Amino acid sequence: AGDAIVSFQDVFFTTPRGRYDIDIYKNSIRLRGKTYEYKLQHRQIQRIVSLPKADDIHHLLVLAIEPPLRKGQTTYPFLVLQFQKDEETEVQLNLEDEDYEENYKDKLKKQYDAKTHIVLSHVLKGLTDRRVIVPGEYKSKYDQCAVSCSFKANEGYLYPLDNAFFFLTKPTLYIPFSDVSMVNISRRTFDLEVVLRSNRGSTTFANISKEEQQLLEQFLKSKNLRVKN
Numbered sequence: 001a002g003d004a005i006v007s008f009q010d011v012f013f014t015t016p017r018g019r020y021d022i023d024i025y026k027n028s029i030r031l032r033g034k035t036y037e038y039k040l041q042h043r044q045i046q047r048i049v050s051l052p053k054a055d056d057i058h059h060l061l062v063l064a065i066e067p068p069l070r071k072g073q074t075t076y077p078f079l080v081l082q083f084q085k086d087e088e089t090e091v092q093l094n095l096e097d098e099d100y101e102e103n104y105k106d107k108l109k110k111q112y113d114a115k116t117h118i119v120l121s122h123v124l125k126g127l128t129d130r131r132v133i134v135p136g137e138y139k140s141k142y143d144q145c146a147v148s149c150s151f152k153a154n155e156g157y158l159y160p161l162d163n164a165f166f167f168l169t170k171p172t173l174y175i176p177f178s179d180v181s182m183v184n185i186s187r188r189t190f191d192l193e194v195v196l197r198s199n200r201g202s203t204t205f206a207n208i209s210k211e212e213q214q215l216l217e218q219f220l221k222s223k224n225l226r227v228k229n
Contacts, residue, residue, distance in 0.1 A: 001032075005104075006093050008120060015080040015172060016071055024123060031079075038069050042128050047174065049133040049166065050121055052085065054146040054157045059085040059117050063124075064174060078172040081120070089116045136162030138219050141211045149192070149205045158192070158205050160219055165194055167205065175203060183220055185213065185229035192216070 001007045004023040011022055013031075021032035029040040047064035061081040068077040090113045093100070100110060107126035112119040121132050135145040138160040146157040146168075154170035167173040175194055184193040190210055195202040208216070221227050 004094060006091055006123060008089070008091075008116070012082045013080060014082050014169065015078055016069070016076055022120070024127065026127070029124075036071055038071070040065075040069070045124070045128050045130060047133055048121065048124055048128070048130045049161075049174075050117060051135060051159060051166075051168075052145070053082070053168075054144060054148070057085060058082050059115070060168070061117055061120060062172065078174070080169065080172060081117075083115075083117045085115070085117075087116045088114065089119055091119060133161060133164070135159070137222075138162075138215075140215060141209075147208050147212050147216070149208045151203065151205050158208070160216065162223070165203075165205075173203065177223060177225060180225055182226035182228060185217070185227070 001021065001023045004025065006024050008022040011020055013020055018033050018036075023030045023032060027042050029042065031038045031040065044065055044067060045063050046066050049060075049062040049064075051060045051062070052058075053060055061083070063079045063081070065077055065079060068075040069079065070076075090111075092111050093104070093108060095104060095110070104126075108123065112122065124130065125132055138145055140147055146159045149156060149158050151167055151171070151173065156170055157168050159166040159168065163177050165173070165175040175196075179196055181195045181197045184195065185191065186193070188210060189207050190213055192205045192208055193202050194205070217227055
């Protein structure tokens, strides 16, 4: 972590399961585990998503990765970083004062003191040129931004974002609304079938409580998708 611009020590990742140092450089990031290290061109980061966990304790960061990270016979297109929602870090950027000027001043702070997730967002945001995708205007029956459901056998939570479906966590799944031909409903509980464009078939999230049906319909159609049953 010598000439790191900045290092985030001992971060808990759930995909891939482990604890990593995140060392950030100008054009790449290195994740540094006890057993594995991966290097990461900033430009491999396609999306940054910042979400609360429907759990009310943690807050997630999720980075979409293309090409995907390797370890080794498995491919990870998503890294999932978990933090305590309220955990904080003070960090000074390790930049010579003048190198901070000729470049990073516009995009980064010299000194941060915020919730760990917001400091890491900001730093990645500013170097990658990405906009952090966050919870939008969706809200469930009990004012949440995710519904409990399943994808295959995997029990989880569906985040209806302003431009995408986002499922957590057993596998993580990101489906942009532009990739959606239409959404179907069908059989307590119901099924949400997300039909892809371009003959890529359809992803079904089963077991959503009927109570959330109405609010999910009004939302998706407020997003101007085609909805039926």
